[PDB]
């Protein structure tokens, strides 16, 4: 997280705001609800208090505007700039302006007013932009899902380094960005995608170029807004530029940023028993047209040519891959080697000699 130079913080704890005007995109009640919610995010973890004024000069004057809207800083029409706010101070200090060329909503569509406002008010209280892609204070908007909003841990620490903690935080365990240097790191799923490793953890993925040592960290929703935050398994069809993503009994096929026509589908369509309730890991072999799918302690092999399950399946992992334990968290394949992830460990399995040839912490895939 980052605070402002000179550490601009408010002096008093009891603060006022005023919704100077409104957008036509939403009713007055919805807008007031969004703004109230946005303030609650910050008040829930600080001694700060917020009060709405219907008339006069408040500390935080909130307005909607379009292009040239009265300051030095015109808005730019649809998308791009969503809003701007000033740090704590007198007059413009604390003020927040919203671009009414955006379509503001209380849903996943257009732009969510509560989300932008919660971000905007972070500035109004003295937080600068964060470099953590998982932080609310990250400079770039991402709809984070209809799930109930939890302030991320980077923002809690930032704001509490300004104003200390509150009496009681309604959920004290705040979402943290995963730490790649932590040797206890376990993974959700892995694939290659256009020659790069995609490593899923929680609502994030790392993308790592083979020529790079520092992975890029994204929110999954940054790439695929209509996909779940957490995924179970991922695999690639490089021939068709397709990635396949599993979560519960659904699965999607993706072409770049696009969900193919017809997806998500049920995994039962793959020929899975109806009692299989998640795929734990998956890997495709293109020189064979065969995909391996893991769940609990079993493997299925799927024929990606003839579009059916192979006959001798399911089999036990303990029979086909002796020594890797009883589950597969995530798996990928490279250069005749299969990489099996089980908790904090990865097993390097040689297809050639049909044995584990190497063992190392899961996080070492991220050069850590």
């Amino acid at each position: 997280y980052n605070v402002f130079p000179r550490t601009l913080k408010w002096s008093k704890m009891n603060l006022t705001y005023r919704i100077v005007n409104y957008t036509p995109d939403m009713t007055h009640s919805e807008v007031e609800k969004a703004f109230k919610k946005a303030f609650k995010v910050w008040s829930d973890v600080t001694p700060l208090n917020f009060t709405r004024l219907h008339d006069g000069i408040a500390d935080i004057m909130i307005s909607f505007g379009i292009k040239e809207h009265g300051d030095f800083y015109p808005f730019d029409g649809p998308s791009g700039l969503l809003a701007h706010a000033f740090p704590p101070g007198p007059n413009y200090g604390g003020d927040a302006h919203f671009d009414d060329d955006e379509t503001w909503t209380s849903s996943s569509k257009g732009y969510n007013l509560f989300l932008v406002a919660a971000h905007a008010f972070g500035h109004s209280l003295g937080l600068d932009h964060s470099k953590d892609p998982g932080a609310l204070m990250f400079p770039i908007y991402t709809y984070t899902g209809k799930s109930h909003f939890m302030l991320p841990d980077d923002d809690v620490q930032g704001i509490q380094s300004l104003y200390g903690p509150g009496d009681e935080d309604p959920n004290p365990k705040h979402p943290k960005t995963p730490d790649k240097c932590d040797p206890s790191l376990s993974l959700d799923a892995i694939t290659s995608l256009r020659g790069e490793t995609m490593i899923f953890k929680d609502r994030f993925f790392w993308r790592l170029h083979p020529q790079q040592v520092d992975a890029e960290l994204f929110l999954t929703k940054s790439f695929w807004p209509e996909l779940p935050n957490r995924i179970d398994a991922a695999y690639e069809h490089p021939s068709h530029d397709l990635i396949f993503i599993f979560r519960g009994r659904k699965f999607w096929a993706l072409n770049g940023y696009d969900i193919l026509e017809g997806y998500p589908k049920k995994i039962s369509e793959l020929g899975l028993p109806k009692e299989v309730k998640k795929i734990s890991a998956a890997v495709h072999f293109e020189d064979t047209g065969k995909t391996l799918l893991f769940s609990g302690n079993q493997v299925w092999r799927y024929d990606d040519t003839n579009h059916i399950m192979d006959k001798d399946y399911p089999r036990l992992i303990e029979e086909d891959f002796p020594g890797i334990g009883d589950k597969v968290d995530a798996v990928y394949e490279k250069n005749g080697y299969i990489y099996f992830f089980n908790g904090p460990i990865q097993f390097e399995y040689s297809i050639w000699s049909n044995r584990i040839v190497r063992v190392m912490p899961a996080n070492s895939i991220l050069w850590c």
């Binding site: 130079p5 030095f72 791009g80 701007h84 706010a85 000033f86 101070g89 413009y92 971000h119 600068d128």
Partner: peptide, 14 residues
């Protein structure tokens, strides 16, 4: 007189 130079802007790309 004041730090209205620390305007921060929130962004999404087209």
């Amino acid at each position: 007189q004041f730090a209205e130079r620390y305007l921060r802007s929130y962004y999404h790309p087209t």
